[PDB]
Amino acid sequence: KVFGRCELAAAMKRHGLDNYRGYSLGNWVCAAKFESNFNTQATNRNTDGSTDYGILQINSRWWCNDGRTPGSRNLCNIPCSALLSSDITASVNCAKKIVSDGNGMNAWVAWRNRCKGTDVQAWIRGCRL
Numbered sequence: 001k002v003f004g005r006c007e008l009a010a011a012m013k014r015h016g017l018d019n020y021r022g023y024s025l026g027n028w029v030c031a032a033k034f035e036s037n038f039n040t041q042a043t044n045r046n047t048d049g050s051t052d053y054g055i056l057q058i059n060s061r062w063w064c065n066d067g068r069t070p071g072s073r074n075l076c077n078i079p080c081s082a083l084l085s086s087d088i089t090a091s092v093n094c095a096k097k098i099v100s101d102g103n104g105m106n107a108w109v110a111w112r113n114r115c116k117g118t119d120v121q122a123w124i125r126g127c128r129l
């Protein structure tokens with residue numbers, strides 16, 4: 001599923017991401033924009049053999065199981081394919097664990113490089129929330 005901007009903002013808000021660990025909603029929308037272009041089916045391989053999955057490009061090295069990332073963890077206790085669902089619940093629940101881990105949203109490279117320090121509120125402008 002390719003979410004619309006405000007549709008995703010609403011879903012993220014309902015699932016408790018607005019201000020989660022101090023990250024306003026626009027941060028999460030901005031992250032999703034640059035990680036996946038709001039496409040729940042997005043996947044991308046990493047040089048280390050791990051793969052990033054879904055709307056927030058969660059990585060198999062640590063967070064989910066894909067059966068093909070030797071030596072990896074599955075900290076979210078889910079198959080990576082669950083992160084490609086039209087329903088973002090699994091991705092959000094896993095993101096909450098990630099962002100609570102020490103480095104906050106810096107875990108998302110696209111967030112640090114394209115969202116951090118910018119006017120992230122623009123990503124939710126116009127949405128009925």
Ligand SMILES: c1cnc2c(c1)ccc1cccnc12
Pocket residue numbers: 034035036044045046047052057109110
């Ligand atoms: C989505 C998924 N993975 C990535 C990015 C965006 C951006 C940069 C990057 C650099 C190294 C490895 N993976 C990624």
Ligand SMILES: [Cl-]
Pocket residue numbers: 024025026027120121122124
């Ligand atoms: Cl915001």
Ligand SMILES: [Cl-]
Pocket residue numbers: 044045
């Ligand atoms: Cl990439």
Ligand SMILES: [Cl-]
Pocket residue numbers: 065066067068
């Ligand atoms: Cl497996």
Ligand SMILES: [Cl-]
Pocket residue numbers: 065066067068069070071072
């Ligand atoms: Cl594995």
Ligand SMILES: [Cl-]
Pocket residue numbers: 011086087088089
């Ligand atoms: Cl959803």
Ligand SMILES: [Cl-]
Pocket residue numbers: 021022103104105
């Ligand atoms: Cl933080």
Ligand code: NA
Pocket residue numbers: 060061062063064065066069072073074
């Ligand atoms: Na894994």
Ligand SMILES: [V+3]
Pocket residue numbers: 044045046052
């Ligand atoms: V990657």
Ligand SMILES: [V+3]
Pocket residue numbers: 101102
């Ligand atoms: V840690």
Ligand SMILES: [V+3]
Pocket residue numbers: 119121
């Ligand atoms: V402002």
Ligand SMILES: [V+3]
Pocket residue numbers: none
């Ligand atoms: V503009």
